[PDB]
């Protein structure tokens, strides 16, 4: 679904803690499986969000079929599941908003406003 030609960061269990957990950035992470129609539908919008958010918010994706352990670690019971990783990287909240590029970016900016205002206080 994704490749080096896009701004979506491929997240394996072999870089997750490093790229995401030990990161001061806001992170959006999609947990998917490539055979899942709802996940395929989301792919273009996810890329659009990642590109729009370049250098502002980190946007990742995990094949939680190929890596079910990581999928299990975050209680992923379906695809696509989108998690938002804010100030506290151990309470990532679930996104249940629209799946358009704009909806994702709107949610991304809201979460970002919160991370920054947390920094301030």
């Amino acid at each position: 679904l994704y490749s080096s030609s896009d701004d979506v960061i491929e997240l394996t269990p072999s870089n997750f803690n490093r790229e995401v957990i030990q990161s001061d950035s806001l992170w959006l992470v999609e947990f998917y499986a490539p055979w899942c129609g709802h996940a395929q539908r989301l792919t273009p919008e996810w890329k659009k969000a990642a590109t729009a958010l370049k250098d502002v918010v980190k946007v990742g994706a995990v094949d939680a079929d190929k890596h079910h352990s990581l999928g299990g670690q975050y209680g992923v019971q379906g695809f696509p599941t989108i998690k938002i990783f804010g100030s506290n990287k151990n309470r990532p909240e679930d996104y249940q908003g629209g799946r358009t590029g704009e909806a994702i970016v709107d949610a991304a900016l809201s979460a970002l406003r919160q991370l920054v205002k947390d920094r301030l206080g």
Binding site: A33, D65, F79
Partner: peptide
Amino acid sequence: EVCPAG
């Protein structure tokens, strides 16, 4: 809106 995991 979602495919169940296995």
